[PDB]
Design a protein around this ligand. Structure first.
Ligand SMILES: Cc1cc2nc3c(=O)[nH]c(=O)nc-3n(C[C@H](O)[C@H](O)[C@H](O)COP(=O)(O)O)c2cc1C
Ligand code: SF4
Ligand code: SF4
Ligand code: SF4
Ligand code: FES
Ligand code: FES
Lengths: 227, 156, 72, 442
């Protein structure tokens, strides 16, 4: 298909999502709830762009890049005023109740939420009220769990239920008191629970084995190897 | 140590007879446990999960999602007073103050003897008849703060 | 430093006989009081569980409302 | 009028209502022309013919959306292999100010049963579910007794009066969350899941409950359909000279002399209803504001009282009709507290799916609490208007948030002076460290 982003013509696939088509072109659209291997939901609204139908249009409509098909004839815009300030408002709503504990966090320089907060360009805080706190759970010797860092993007339960097939983790909660985990305290019996460290964009599900003797990502000397 | 009575199992199975998917009867199974025992304990989630076949995470999420599925232990009479806007205009702060002066508690907590549990409710659907409340599936309308002690003395 | 831990004293009277003993270890840097920032504590702002600091006991943090609670 | 004559020509719903507010059972329903439209549908009407009559009768949505049910029923697939279709009745409200279905199910259950019979034969559905609430107990008892009586009378079962159309009706009493009223979240809650809504355009008419084509309709829509099929279509177009055909259960509530519920044709203005049907308000009240729909629509001032309560007429006034159950606000009630309570209900009765509603309705709650307690700060009114601009349709996953922030829109637009007077202290988001010079911008 042929789409037009930022007043520029691009040739992307027809049956795929607009978010993955824009990310395949090297463009930058922030996202929290979409995963390439888990499909697309509307748990966040971070991938918002402004869509136009005709070649020339004034108002348009704020749509989600992970809910819009990359069809022939779409004229979407990314770095306009309204979509950028809406994405800044969404990251502001995510920092409305987020604990001030980044240097004592196992993600740190490996955190997607930091990257998408800096990418949207939000530094000034206008929230002056109290935050939201949760208790913790013991999820075995591998997955350290702490719920304060969460942004309710539903990627963990989506992976753990639809993809991994595990029957342990899930959503228990309400409007704002939404919880992601286990109804009791115990080890996650699924054999794929270790992918929650990279599935979660926040520091909720973290590597306990890496939490012991911990170092940051930039201090890590990496290598490509085989298990 | 939780177990399910025979009447609970018959009611739950008859409810799953009404639906294509046995998952659809989870809310009614939790409601049956609520009608028999007053609240949903921790073992009831696993009991409903084992009877229905769905995992315990989904049953826990259903129990913790809906407002009138109580997981904390409540009293023998759940007072559910309206917290919405029509009864706000008609006046629910007066009856809330009357309840707080009679039961000497706060909303969301139970009395020390386990006699009443005070709770706000989204709406009752009785907006035209003034302020409304429910005690033990019994509705009351056209309420006044003076009639609250008279209304509260007819419950065990 | 987000905790104002590492600081620069006005002390400059240094100089060692060996290059090996110019590497200051943990016991050579940690002093017994608050320095240029006297009344700041990071862990009163952090959200993690701390001895003497439960959840919701930090600054601008509400008490953790239970998921199973009766409040709608 | 104080005394209203309920002839069936102008009041097709409540003309058979009893004076003592007692439920009309099967014998009394059949005495007052009962199951005649159902008989016509199940004997001499094709399902496509019934769909066409509903489409051309001008019946629209009565749950607040205002979408025509004929075009809703036209979205069913034409494949005959998908014969596992479902019909759902949105008996759930939990909306402040919405109380018409309580009357419609407490004293007219057989009308709803006949409506589901007609709509299930029109949609070729084999199962119907009345999604009620746990708060409605007498209505559930009356509906179950009406279902039992209809099953005893040879209806609502297998081969209904010798047709071969098999239909079974069930009542599902929900535990209660306000988000369960929306059709996709009602479908999700019916499947025993958490009541999170679903994305569009995978429609419920193509893939709804358990992947099967479903149609979700309000109580009043299914109460208006059997009168259409029993009295005719031209009669239904010849009861009100307005673009919205049919009658609506209107009525005012909130410190009124006679807060009630009356069936009136469309195009009737709110002023005549308030002064004659509601009888005016009580002593010492000046009627400073009103809201057309119960708690989901936005406020209107006294200058908009002359507007006829239609869909399009209130649409161009920066508003919407909603459930057409009006709510009155007097000068004795501060709108800061009122809008704070509305936002509190919307914040604590939303779901936890999508970000903007999730983390903006509590923010609006806290800002309105600060304005109520006199601790308002510079940067709150513009924050609220940016919030309500960013919580419109399309920005959120479902339509709970636009209906949540519409009262914020009207309270900001009209009664701005109260919110401006709610701000006393200056801006204070950060406190000093007394070792670091602050970055005070001027
Ligand atoms: C948050 C929300 C709550 C709703 N609650 C109800 C309700 O309680 N009753 C209702 O009939 N429609 C409600 N609706 C509207 C439904 O989406 C839908 O219009 C209804 O189920 C059927 O519409 P109809 O009148 O065209 O048949 C609600 C919509 C939203 C967004
Ligand atoms: S715990 Fe992580 S993956 Fe799960 S919803 Fe929260 S931020 Fe998303
Ligand atoms: S998960 Fe939260 S606390 Fe941890 S680095 Fe990311 S933003 Fe900071
Ligand atoms: S707007 Fe979003 S969070 Fe709010 S009720 Fe709808 S889907 Fe749920
Ligand atoms: S990435 Fe599209 S809404 Fe979350
Ligand atoms: S607003 Fe109280 S009963 Fe509806």
């Amino acid at each position: 298909a042929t789409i037009h982003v930022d007043g520029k013509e691009y040739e992307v696939n027809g049956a795929d999502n607009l978010l993955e088509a824009c990310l395949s072109l090297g463009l930058d659209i922030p996202y929290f709830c979409w995963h390439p291997a888990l499909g697309s939901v509307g748990a966040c609204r971070q991938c918002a762009v402004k869509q136009y139908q005709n070649a020339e249009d004034t108002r348009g409509r704020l749509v989600m890049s992970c809910m819009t098909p990359a069809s022939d004839g779409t004229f979407i815009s990314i770095d306009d005023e309204e979509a950028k300030q809406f994405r800044e408002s969404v990251v502001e709503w995510l920092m409305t109740n987020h604990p001030h504990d980044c240097p004592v966090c196992e993600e740190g320089g490996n955190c997607h939420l930091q990257d998408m907060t800096v990418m949207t360009g939000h530094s000034f805080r206008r929230y002056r009220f109290t935050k939201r706190t949760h208790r913790n759970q013991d999820l075995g010797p591998f997955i350290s769990h702490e719920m304060n860092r969460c942004i309710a993007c539903y990627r963990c339960v989506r992976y753990y239920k639809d993809y991994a097939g595990g029957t342990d983790l899930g959503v228990y909660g309400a409007h704002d008191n939404v919880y992601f985990g286990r109804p009791e305290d115990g080890t996650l019996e699924s054999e794929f629970s270790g992918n929650l460290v990279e599935i979660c964009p926040t520091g909720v599900f973290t590597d306990k084995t890496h939490s012991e003797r911990y170092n940051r990502k930039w201090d890590m000397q990496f290598a490509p190897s085989i298990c | 140590a939780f177990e399910l009575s025979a009447a609970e199992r018959e009611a739950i199975e008859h409810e799953m007879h009404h639906y294509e998917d046995p998952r659809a009867a989870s809310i009614e199974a939790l409601k049956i446990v609520q009608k028999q025992r007053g609240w949903v304990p921790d073992g009831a989630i696993h009991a409903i999960a084992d009877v229905l076949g769905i995992p315990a995470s989904d049953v826990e999420g259903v129990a913790t999602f809906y407002s009138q599925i109580f997981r904390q232990p409540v009293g023998r009479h759940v007072i559910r007073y309206c917290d919405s806007v029509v009864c706000h205009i008609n006046g629910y702060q007066g009856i809330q103050a009357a309840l707080e002066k009679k039961l000497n508690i706060k909303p969301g907590q139970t009395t020390f003897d386990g006699r009443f549990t005070l709770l706000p409710t989204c709406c009752l659907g009785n907006c035209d008849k003034g302020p409304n409340m429910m005690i033990d599936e019994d509705t009351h309308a056209h309420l006044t703060p003076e009639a609250i002690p008279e209304l509260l003395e007819r419950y065990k | 430093c987000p905790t104002t831990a590492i600081q620069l004293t006005p002390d400059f009277e240094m100089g060692e006989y060996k290059r090996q003993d110019l590497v200051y270890e943990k016991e050579d840097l940690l002093i017994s009081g608050p320095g240029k920032y006297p009344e700041y504590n990071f862990y009163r702002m952090a959200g993690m569980a701390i001895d003497g600091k439960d959840k919701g006991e930090a600054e601008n943090e509400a008490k953790p409302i239970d998921v199973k609670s009766l409040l709608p | 009028m104080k005394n209203i004559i309920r002839t069936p020509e102008t009041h097709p719903l409540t003309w058979r209502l009893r004076d003592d507010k007692q439920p009309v059972w099967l014998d009394e329903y059949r005495s007052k022309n009962g199951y005649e439209g159902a008989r016509k549908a199940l004997t001499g009407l094709s399902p496509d013919e019934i769909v066409n009559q509903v489409k051309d009768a001008g019946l629209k949505g009565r749950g607040g959306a205002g979408f025509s049910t004929g075009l809703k029923w036209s979205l069913m697939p034409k494949d005959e292999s998908m014969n596992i279709r479902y019909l759902l009745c949105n008996a759930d409200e939990m909306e402040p100010g919405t109380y018409k279905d309580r009357l419609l199910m407490e004293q007219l259950p057989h009308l709803l049963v006949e409506g589901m019979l007609i709509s299930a034969f029109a949609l070729k559905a084999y199962r119907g579910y009345i999604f009620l609430r746990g708060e409605y107990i007498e209505a559930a008892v009356n509906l179950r007794r009406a279902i039992a009586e209809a099953t005893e009378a040879g209806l609502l079962g297998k081969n209904i009066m010798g047709t071969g159309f098999d239909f079974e009706l069930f009542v599902h009493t929900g535990a209660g969350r306000y988000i369960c009223g929306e059709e996709t979240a009602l479908i999700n809650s019916l499947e025993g899941r958490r009541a999170n809504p679903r994305s569009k355009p995978p429609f419920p008419a193509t893939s709804g409950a358990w992947g099967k084509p479903t149609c979700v309709n309000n109580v009043e829509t299914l109460c208006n359909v059997p009168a259409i099929l029993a009295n005719g279509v031209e009669w239904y177009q010849n009861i009100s000279k307005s673009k919205d055909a049919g009658t609506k259960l209107m009525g005012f509530s909130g410190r009124v002399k006679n807060p009630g519920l009356w069936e009136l044709p469309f195009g009737t203005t709110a002023r005549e209803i308030l002064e004659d049907y509601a009888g005016g308000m009580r002593d010492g009240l000046k009627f400073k504001a009103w809201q057309p729909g119960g708690a989901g629509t936005d406020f209107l001032t006294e200058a908009h009282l002359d507007l006829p309560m239609e869909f399009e007429s209130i649409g161009k006034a920066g508003s919407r009709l909603g459930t057409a159950l009006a709510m009155a606000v007097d000068h004795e009630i501060n709108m800061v507290s009122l809008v704070r309570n509305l936002e509190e209900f919307f914040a604590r009765e939303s779901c936890g799916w999508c970000t903007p509603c999730r983390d903006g309705l509590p923010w609006s709650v806290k800002i309105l609490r600060a304005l109520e307690r006199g601790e308002g700060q510079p940067g709150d009114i513009e924050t609220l208007e940016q919030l309500c601009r960013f919580l419109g349709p399309g920005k959120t996953f479902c339509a709970h948030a636009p209906g949540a922030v519409e009262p914020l829109q009207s309270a900001i637009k009209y009664f701005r002076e109260e919110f401006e007077a709610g701000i006393k202290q200056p801006f204070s988001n950060t406190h000093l460290i007394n070792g670091i010079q602050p970055n005070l911008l001027k």
